[PDB]
Design a protein around this ligand. Structure first.
Ligand SMILES: Nc1nc2[nH]c(S)nc2c(=O)[nH]1
Length: 160
């Protein structure tokens, strides 16, 4: 029953984006082994990867968890599946991504999962809201605290 502090990155660009983020946090906190303990501000962020698609809202969440990293990944996938479900066929699918950004101070390298997220230091839509709740946490690949990894990116703006 060793409690680990972990940080998750959440994002949605289709549908009621703020509602997708809020629901994901609520679902995650409903698992017995996960307690949501802090939430970053939401940021609106230009899309990374394909450029012709809507802007994302992104945030990060701090959790206190007794789950293993792979148990945590299970809860994340179960939460994505759930919030992807269509409401009305004609309104289209909904999106939500939930990624594990940090799990304690551990480095994990498995075929099914790398934590810290391996290219997360490339992504302002991760590091800017991460810095609001995890400024002093050391990211173990780089050995930098989040506050020192974070960089200026004008494509990421506070949403509210
Ligand atoms: N800004 C931004 N771009 C993204 N591309 C994918 S895929 N996922 C995301 C995301 O969550 N945010």
């Amino acid at each position: 029953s060793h409690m680990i502090q972990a940080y998750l990155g959440l994002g949605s660009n289709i549908g009621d984006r703020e509602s997708q983020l809020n629901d994901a946090i609520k679902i995650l906190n409903e698992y017995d082994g996960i307690s949501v303990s802090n939430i970053s501000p939401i940021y609106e962020t230009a899309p990374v990867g394909y450029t012709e698609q809507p802007n994302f809202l992104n945030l990060c969440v701090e959790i206190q968890t007794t789950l293993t990293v792979l148990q945590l990944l299970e809860c994340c996938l179960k939460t994505e599946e759930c919030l992807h479900r269509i409401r009305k066929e004609r309104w289209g699918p909904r999106t939500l991504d939930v990624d594990i950004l940090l799990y304690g101070e551990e480095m994990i390298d498995l075929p099914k999962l790398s934590v810290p997220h391996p290219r997360m230091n490339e992504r302002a839509f991760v590091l800017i809201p991460l810095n609001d709740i995890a400024a002093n946490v050391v990211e173990p690949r780089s050995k930098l605290k989040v506050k020192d990894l974070v960089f200026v990116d004008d494509s990421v703006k506070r949403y509210k």
